[PDB]
Design an enzyme around this catalytic site. Structure first.
Site, PDB file in Angstrom:
ATOM      1  CD  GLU A 100      -3.318  -0.609   0.505  1.00  0.00           C
ATOM      2  OE1 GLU A 100      -3.276   0.329  -0.317  1.00  0.00           O
ATOM      3  OE2 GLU A 100      -4.382  -1.168   0.844  1.00  0.00           O
ATOM      4  CG  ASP A 101       0.621   3.573  -2.429  1.00  0.00           C
ATOM      5  OD1 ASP A 101       0.881   2.908  -3.453  1.00  0.00           O
ATOM      6  OD2 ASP A 101      -0.500   4.078  -2.211  1.00  0.00           O
ATOM      7  CB  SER A 102       4.979   1.020   2.671  1.00  0.00           C
ATOM      8  OG  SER A 102       5.780   1.517   3.723  1.00  0.00           O
ATOM      9  NE  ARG A 145      -1.191   4.854  -7.235  1.00  0.00           N
ATOM     10  CZ  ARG A 145      -0.631   4.309  -6.165  1.00  0.00           C
ATOM     11  NH1 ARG A 145       0.643   3.953  -6.155  1.00  0.00           N
ATOM     12  NH2 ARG A 145      -1.368   4.115  -5.077  1.00  0.00           N
ATOM     13  N   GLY A 156       5.916   6.973  -1.314  1.00  0.00           N
ATOM     14  CA  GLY A 156       5.618   6.113  -0.189  1.00  0.00           C
ATOM     15  C   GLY A 156       6.514   6.423   0.984  1.00  0.00           C
TER      16      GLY A 156
END
Ligand SMILES: [Mg+2]
Ligand SMILES: [Zn+2]
Ligand SMILES: [Zn+2]
Ligand SMILES: [Zn+2]
Lengths: 260, 115, 96, 67, 35, 98, 46, 404, 51, 479
Positions: free
Chosen positions: J204-206, J377, J345
């Site tokens: 999740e965008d980390s 994206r 992130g």
RNA sequence: AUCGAGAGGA
């Protein structure tokens, strides 16, 4: 039910790297030896810096970090030295540290390059690797006329688990099953994958046939040294350290079992 | 600010025990070994060596949390054996293998250096 | 003397105008600094370009949400005058 | 600002390579040839030298506070 | 005389480089204030 | 003091009629990085008012081609109203028609 | 007691007394900088 | 504690949590709980409230703890499911030909918190005992619950022909007596939709058992993913030359069809459909042609994908992406619209100064015939920028309208 | 209808696959800066005296 | 048009528009008209010839500049109103003859279509391969990135400033970044990035970061804060003075120890400071008697080291001091990072080198990002940048990612990469660090330019338990 | 400290 009987062959041995093959051992042991190469081989590195003067364009922490990253020859001294945390002395002593001094001032109109050559050691056997008798010296900072750097540093024993400056390796190549006989990887299009340098296959063959009964053996290593230790010394120290860890665990487990 | 010291991953805190032994009550002849300040290195080698033992029915390890420095090893053996004996024998076997490897590496290095 | 005018840096009337990189570094100025801003009480200030409708041009817009079917507009403005721009509208009434 | 002592990825020493790399370039080496000559084989170490910006010279262009 | 494609790419970026050597990037601000 | 106040506060107008004056002119130069400074020095503003909810003034008009960057715009309440010059764009300073 | 300051222009060290206006005795510059502390500064080389 | 992310839209935006102390400076969250909060980890910040009395603590414990919030009364379905990494990995894990060795099974069981300590009999005993992923997942499933679902790629004709109960593609998820007998798990089976496995776990077992179910799925599947792996790269954005030629032929045919429609309209051989003027009829025909071309090219790109393609793995698992994303990456990006219409004549009878006046062809009015991998031409780039600006504005305005 | 409140904290969120869905990882400084008032009883007097 | 091209009576800034359908000719000399230069096209030919390029190549010696191009009537400035009447060729390829001519009446040609972008969007590599909102997001995140904002930062006492230890110029650049001086003052580091799922801490965008790389200075930065204070003698009754207050005479002295100050009431450079430490000692005489403490304290949770101390007089002649405190920031969990393609992130966890996955060589990723960003994206520019960066690092050149370049496509880059002994699509066989086993799937890995954003967790973490309250209402304060 | 303004974050 019992231990393996590994064999070793050295294929290349230079001042900077050692290339060798371990056979008749398990993948877990090979990977643990690799991990010990990276993280649990003790080394001497600067870990204490007192700055008396710093007129350079770099702030004190910048200089201290760069000094900490300078490799120092530790081949035989490191085994003798104690961990500073374990020493009974005051701040530092010859049994747990090595003192360094640096005092450079620029009094000319040409830029003065402060290198590891300016790091003066108290121990002749613990010095910057580039200061050993080509390879240039490691740049610390550049000074112009009127700027000055004066500091005192101590080098202590440690390993890569605490900080990467104590990591003795400069790249550990590790490989097994060059041809994909165990199918531990699955290539969607095998033909477009370049052959391993340890591959033994014809140019028309992309991978070996599947081996249902195969197990990972014959692990290939290329340990490259950063200069603080000789590569073979890195390997031997790693083996000794892993053995020591296992022995300590054995002693603790024996105490725990007897306690109940 | 909240960063732990780097030495916390391998230095035992005062009063901390290196290894603790508990009984697994779900099934017979099963033990849980909790080891502090160790990571995948020792856990993996010990687990594989245990799996090499024919009297070991179950051998596994895990790191409960990467930000902590504890490994748990679970060993189940046949009733004629003991998980404690299996653990001790696995460590002894690993030490023997490492000693042999060190000797043979020394010999190979000498051979390569002479020619 | 009637007042002081803040000067935009690197403009024609800034002390840094037409200085070599060596001269700028002698003054503790970055040669790569582009200028184009002011210093007011030590604070660097940049003027943001403001959009507006062009003047002296006839524009015909339709507004059927209004009493006028069509409306001509011209924001007439002489070259310079403290008097603001004078806007004259010409519209035809919406049928009904 | 100044050449890093080590390669971020593998830890190979690159802090003693910048002046030699500059010298080879003025000797009409291509950057790839110069990197080969300096012994930088892995592309992480090659990136270290290829992407470096020696900002410390521009900083040395300014007079120090203390004479 | 005529620029060819293989030469065109270099030529167009030479023209752009000359433009930016002349004007810079904040020319509008300086010119407006000078006026 | 009039020039100093207008440049210091960004209220384009007399200090007494500050509520009437348009604000946001003469902002503090952004120095987080060099690109931030360059972009701030090439910034354009539509005084429409961020409160309005009509999409038309915030839309990317065809005539922006080559004059205003089609990508750079704040993604918050000012989307489409704050613009940035294209690289080769120039703004005329005016001349006499005589 | 001395409170040595460094002139920003001529780089000369000159004593300044509290309540004395800031001014270099050599060139008359009005910007001065404090000298580095003598307190022990120790860093880990991390 | 009470944990909260703004804006607070529904009950599940503030839920009770048990505190665990960890080294570094951030709040740490389980992945499955991100959906109720609408949270991700690109700089999001969340609020913590500490109840100050035994009464408020009991209130939060008995009413608002995360496990009690698993099912929402808004739509009588779970608000939490299995999400991206675990979802993709579980889709790969429950495939028919997934076989595990003794040691791998032992590790995975190491990560199963509700495990009773009995190693199940392997599905294959000779040669070389091997366990399947379905066996391990069955160990994960709680109680003895019964559920039937279909995988996303389940063919529509399968349920009517033979092999209805023995699926050739291993679709048709069947969980019986707590055992995963058949089927590939995906979003339809482990997601937030009504009737999923997690929903049935919550309805049949309590909130505590279902909480353990969530945690165990995540831990076991992530540790297996350490072996399996998962990536996305350039190779997943490519198609074979035959697919490219087919897409190019489709685009060229669509362009010729639009040219024919334009020629018909220019010679007054076009008749308006009822309830539409001539211009609306022409726009309808052009948009029909271009939409059909886009659909055909997208279908071709979909067909070209191999079983190893990672875009397709992500889409089929339901973890992230759609078939439209694949079509746009591999095949044409498609038509750009502003206010529901093709790119308007912003200039005089012209979308850009690079076209002639009264050019109604696909290129002029904003049909992007290139894929993201091929790259857009300058005019396509500008038209696409206009399209994206539309969505940014829509977000920025809808926020306040909906808030009021 | 709304207020600022005591005994609250805020910071960035990061993932943790090794936490239960009903758990939240809290940094040490936050935990050391917030308090819960526990009533002394003979059951807990020793623990609270140590604290 | 002839006069304007010769620059006789009409300056280049003047716009002349003829509306043929109407019968109007409109000439504008006003200020505030946005215009851009364009190449003039005669019958079907550029007026720009080889000789102009030859003269420009030697512009250092022959003093032939851009102004000479405008003087020779080869380039023209066109505003929007005049652009309405222009027939524009995107490239000179449009002027070539075709079996069916499209226009055949071009009046102008673009110098290069990439000039439609602004300063921030000009650093995105392969922007024509990304979804447009991602380019928009990068246009802001680039302004939030850390680098060396200006070369003379040592002499500026800015309120806030961030400086990266080891800025690098990207291995993959666009041709327009030459004029933005991004080479001289870059903000970012080329990082070995693997797009993989590895332990689940980059979901999740980390992102997962290499702790050994961080130990070596990877994305290390230094934060500067400046404090200013002045002593005012406004009235004969009350006057402020810089001094080291003593608890006998001054009253409002906090419990912080004032011994870090010098006898002038100012802290010295090189002194370690923490939250609620006094750095400027100042007292105001009253109308613990006769003096009230009004000292300046370091902001709570700042913990830096005094960098330099400047003393002056302000406009009204009062003594004036500025203190710069520096704080070294090591990247940690919660810090924000972003590539040049809108992929942003926070760091989710950091692993040491031995725990990271590795190639058959010793190479481990500096950063691991999650594959679940790309699908929705659609930032294919990121993947192409990774591929070209691997090619450029192996070859020893700087890759060209200028947007609308027909000479560069993914197949050519892939063929180049294969020549260096790598899988042509940028994939690699990675081994699991924990166990040493091969990972079944091959992992996309290569150099990618990453930025460290100013948003750091240690500047956001906050908690309260019964602190100060507002005066009017007795509720907790804000901020 | 208050007020206002601006720039940002989700
Ligand atoms: Mg978010
Ligand atoms: Zn000692
Ligand atoms: Zn390297
Ligand atoms: Zn002086």
């Amino acid at each position: 039910p019992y231990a393996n009987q590994p064999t070793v062959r050295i294929t290349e041995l230079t001042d900077e790297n050692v290339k060798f093959i371990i056979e008749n051992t398990d993948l877990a042991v090979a990977n643990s030896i690799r991990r010990v190469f990276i993280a649990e081989v003790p080394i001497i590195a600067i870990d204490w810096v007192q700055i008396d003067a710093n007129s350079s364009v770099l702030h004190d922490e910048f200089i201290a970090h760069r000094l900490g990253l300078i490799p120092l020859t530790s081949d035989d001294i490191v085994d003798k030295l104690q961990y500073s945390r374990d020493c009974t002395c005051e701040e530092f002593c010859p049994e747990c540290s090595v003192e360094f001094t640096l005092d450079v001032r620029c009094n000319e109109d040409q830029t003065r390059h402060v290198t590891s050559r300016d790091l003066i050691s108290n121990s002749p056997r613990v010095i910057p690797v580039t200061s050993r008798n080509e390879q240039d010296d490691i740049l610390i900072v550049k000074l112009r006329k009127g700027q000055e750097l004066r500091l005192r540093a101590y080098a202590k024993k440690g390993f890569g688990k605490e900080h990467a400056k104590w990591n003795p390796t400069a790249g550990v190549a590790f490989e097994y099953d060059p041809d994909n006989a165990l199918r531990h990887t699955v290539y969607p299009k095998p033909e477009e994958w370049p052959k391993s340098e340890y591959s033994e296959l014809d140019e028309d063959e992309s991978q070996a046939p599947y081996d249902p009964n195969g197990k990972p053996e014959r692990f290939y290593y290329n340990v490259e040294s950063c200069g603080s230790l000789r590569p073979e010394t890195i390997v031997l120290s790693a083996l000794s350290g892993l053995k020591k860890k296992l022995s300590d665990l054995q002693t603790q487990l024996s105490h725990e079992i007897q306690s109940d | 600010m909240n960063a732990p010291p780097a030495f916390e991953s391998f230095l035992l805190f005062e009063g901390e025990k290196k290894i603790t032994i508990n009984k697994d009550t779900k099934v017979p002849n099963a033990c849980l070994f909790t080891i502090n300040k160790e990571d995948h290195t020792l856990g993996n080698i010990i687990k594989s060596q245990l799996l090499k033992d024919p009297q070991v029915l179950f051998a596994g390890y895990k790191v409960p949390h990467p930000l902590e420095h504890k490994i748990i090893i679970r060993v189940q053996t046949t009733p004629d054996y003991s998980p404690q004996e299996a653990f001790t024998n696995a460590i002894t076997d690993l030490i023997s293998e490492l000693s042999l490897l060190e000797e043979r590496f020394r010999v190979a290095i000498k051979d390569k250096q002479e020619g | 003397f009637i007042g002081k005018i803040p000067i935009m840096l690197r403009s024609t009337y800034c002390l840094l105008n037409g200085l070599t990189d060596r001269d700028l570094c002698e003054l503790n100025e970055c040669p790569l600094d582009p200028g184009g801003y002011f210093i007011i009480n030590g604070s660097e200030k940049v003027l943001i370009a403001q959009e507006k409708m062009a003047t002296n041009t006839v524009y015909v817009f339709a507004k059927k949400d209004s009493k006028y079917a069509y409306t001509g507009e011209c924001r007439s403005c002489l070259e310079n005058s403290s008097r603001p721009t004078s806007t004259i509208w010409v519209s035809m009434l919406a049928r009904g | 600002m100044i050449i890093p002592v080590r390669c971020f990825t593998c830890g190979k020493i690159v802090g003693n390579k910048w002046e030699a790399y500059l010298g080879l370039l003025q000797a009409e080496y291509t950057e790839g040839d110069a990197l080969d000559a300096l012994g930088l084989k892995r592309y992480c170490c090659r990136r270290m030298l290829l992407a470096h910006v020696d900002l410390i010279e521009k900083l040395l262009n300014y007079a120090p506070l203390e004479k | 005389d005529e620029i060819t494609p293989d030469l065109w790419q270099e030529a167009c970026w030479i023209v752009i480089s000359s433009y930016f050597d002349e004007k810079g990037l904040v020319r509008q601000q300086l010119d407006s204030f000078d006026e | 003091d009039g020039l100093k106040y207008s440049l210091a506060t960004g209220n384009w107008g007399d200090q007494k009629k500050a509520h009437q004056a348009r604000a946001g002119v003469s902002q503090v130069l952004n120095r987080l990085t060099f690109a931030s400074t360059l972009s701030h020095l090439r910034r354009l503003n539509s005084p429409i008012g961020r409160d309005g909810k009509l999409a038309k003034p915030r839309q990317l008009h065809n005539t922006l081609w080559g004059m205003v960057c089609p990508a750079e715009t704040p993604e918050g309440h000012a989307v489409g109203l704050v613009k940035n010059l294209a690289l080769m764009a120039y703004i005329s300073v005016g001349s006499q028609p005589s | 007691q001395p409170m040595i300051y460094i002139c920003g222009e001529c780089h000369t060290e000159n004593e300044i007394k509290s309540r004395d206006p800031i001014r270099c005795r050599e060139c008359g510059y009005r910007i001065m900088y404090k000298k580095r502390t003598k307190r022990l500064v120790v860093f880990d080389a991390r | 504690v009470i944990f909260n992310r703004q804006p607070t839209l529904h009950k599940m935006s503030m839920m009770g949590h048990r505190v665990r102390i960890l080294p570094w400076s951030t709040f740490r969250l389980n992945l499955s709980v991100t959906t109720p909060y609408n949270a991700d980890f690109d700089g999001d910040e969340m609020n913590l409230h500490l109840p100050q009395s035994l009464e408020t603590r009991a209130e939060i414990q008995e009413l608002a703890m995360v496990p009690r919030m698993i099912v929402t009364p808004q739509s009588n379905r779970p608000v939490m499911g299995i999400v991206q990494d675990t979802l993709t990995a579980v889709r790969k894990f429950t495939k028919r030909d997934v076989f595990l060795e003794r040691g791998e099974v032992m590790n995975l069981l190491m990560f199963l918190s509700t495990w009773d300590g009995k190693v199940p009999q392997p599905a294959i005993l000779k040669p070389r005992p091997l366990w399947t992923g379905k066996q391990i997942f069955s160990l994960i499933i709680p109680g003895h619950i019964n559920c039937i679902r279909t995988h996303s790629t389940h063919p529509d004709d399968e349920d009517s022909g033979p092999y209805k109960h023995i699926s050739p593609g291993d679709t048709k998820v069947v969980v019986e007596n707590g055992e995963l007998i058949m089927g590939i798990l995906c979003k339809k089976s482990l997601g937030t939709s009504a009737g999923s496995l997690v929903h049935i776990s919550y309805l049949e077992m309590g909130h505590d058992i279902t909480r353990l179910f969530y945690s165990n799925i995540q831990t076991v599947i992530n540790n297996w993913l350490l072996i399996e792996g998962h990536t996305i790269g350039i190779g997943d954005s490519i198609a074979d030359s035959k697919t490219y030629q087919d897409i190019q032929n489709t685009i060229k045919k669509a362009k010729q069809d639009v040219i024919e429609v334009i020629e018909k309209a220019h010679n007054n051989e076009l008749e308006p459909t009822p309830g539409n003027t001539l211009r609306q009829t022409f726009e309808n025909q052009v948009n029909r042609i271009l939409n059909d071309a886009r659909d055909k090219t997208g279908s071709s790109a979909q067909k070209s994908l191999s079983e190893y393609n990672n875009f397709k793995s992500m889409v089929v698992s339901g973890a992230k992406g759609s078939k439209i994303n694949i079509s746009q990456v591999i095949a044409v990006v498609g038509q750009q619209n502003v206010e529901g219409k093709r790119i308007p004549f912003g200039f005089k009878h012209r979308t850009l100064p690079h076209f002639i006046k009264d050019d109604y062809g696909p290129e002029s009015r904003g049909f992007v015939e290139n894929s993201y991998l091929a790259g857009l031409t300058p005019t396509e780039f500008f038209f696409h920028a206009m399209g994206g600006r539309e969505g940014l504005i829509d977000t920025a305005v809808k926020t306040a309208e909906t808030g009021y | 209808m709304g207020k600022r409140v005591d005994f609250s904290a805020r910071t960035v969120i990061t993932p943790d696959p090794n936490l239960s869905i009903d758990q939240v990882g809290v940094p040490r400084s936050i935990a050391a800066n917030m308090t819960f008032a526990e009533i002394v009883t003979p059951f807990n007097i020793d623990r609270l005296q140590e604290l | 048009r002839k006069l304007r091209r010769q620059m006789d009576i009409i300056v280049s800034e003047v716009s002349m528009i003829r509306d043929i359908r109407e019968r109007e000719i409109r000439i504008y000399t006003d200020a505030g008209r946005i215009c851009r230069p364009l190449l003039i096209v005669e019958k079907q030919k550029l007026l720009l010839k080889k000789r102009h390029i030859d003269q420009l190549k030697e512009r250092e010696y022959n003093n032939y500049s851009w102004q000479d191009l405008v003087a020779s009537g080869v380039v023209e400035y066109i505003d929007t109103l005049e652009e309405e009447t222009v027939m524009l060729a995107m490239t000179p390829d449009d002027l070539q003859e075709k079996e069916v001519a499209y226009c055949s009446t071009y009046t102008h040609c673009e110098i290069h279509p990439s000039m439609i972008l602004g300063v921030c969007a000009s650093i995105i590599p392969f922007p024509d391969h990304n979804q447009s909102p991602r380019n928009t997001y990068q246009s802001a995140m680039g302004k939030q990135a850390m680098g060396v904002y200006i070369t003379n930062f040592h002499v500026r006492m800015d309120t806030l400033a961030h400086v990266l230890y080891y800025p690098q110029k990207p291995l993959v650049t666009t041709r327009s970044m030459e004029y933005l001086r991004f080479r001289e003052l870059p903000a970012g580091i080329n990082s070995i990035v693997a797009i993989a799922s590895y332990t689940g801490y980059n979901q999740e965008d980390s992102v997962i970061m290499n702790r050994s790389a961080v130990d070596r200075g990877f994305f290390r930065s230094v934060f500067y804060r400046s404090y200013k204070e002045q002593e005012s003698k406004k009235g004969f009754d009350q006057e402020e003075v810089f001094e080291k207050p003593t608890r006998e005479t001054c009253q409002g002295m906090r419990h912080a120890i004032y011994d870090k100050l010098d006898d002038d009431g100012l802290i010295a450079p090189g002194v370690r400071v923490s939250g609620d430490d006094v750095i400027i000692g100042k007292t105001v005489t009253l109308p613990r008697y006769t003096k009230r403490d009004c000292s300046t304290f370091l902001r709570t949770s700042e913990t830096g080291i005094v960098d330099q101390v400047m003393v002056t007089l302000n406009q009204e002649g009062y003594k004036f001091c500025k203190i710069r405190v520096r704080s070294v920031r090591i990247p940690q969990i919660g810090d924000k990072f972003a590539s040049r393609h809108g992929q942003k992130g926070t760091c989710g966890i950091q692993y040491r080198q031995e725990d990271m996955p590795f190639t058959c060589e010793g190479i481990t990723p500096d950063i691991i990002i999650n594959p679940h960003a790309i699908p929705s994206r659609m930032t294919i520019g990121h993947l192409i940048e990774c591929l070209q960066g691997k090619v450029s690092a192996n070859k020893g050149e700087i890759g060209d990612a200028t947007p609308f370049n027909d000479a560069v496509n993914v197949q050519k880059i892939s063929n180049l990469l294969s020549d260096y002994g790598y899988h042509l699509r940028g994939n690699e066989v990675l081994y699991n660090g924990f166990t040493g086993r091969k990972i079944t799937s091959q992992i996309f890995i290569g150099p990618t330019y990453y930025q460290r954003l100013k948003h750091m967790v240690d500047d956001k973490i906050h908690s309260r338990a019964r602190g100060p309250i507002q005066i009017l209402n007795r509720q907790p304060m804000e901020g």
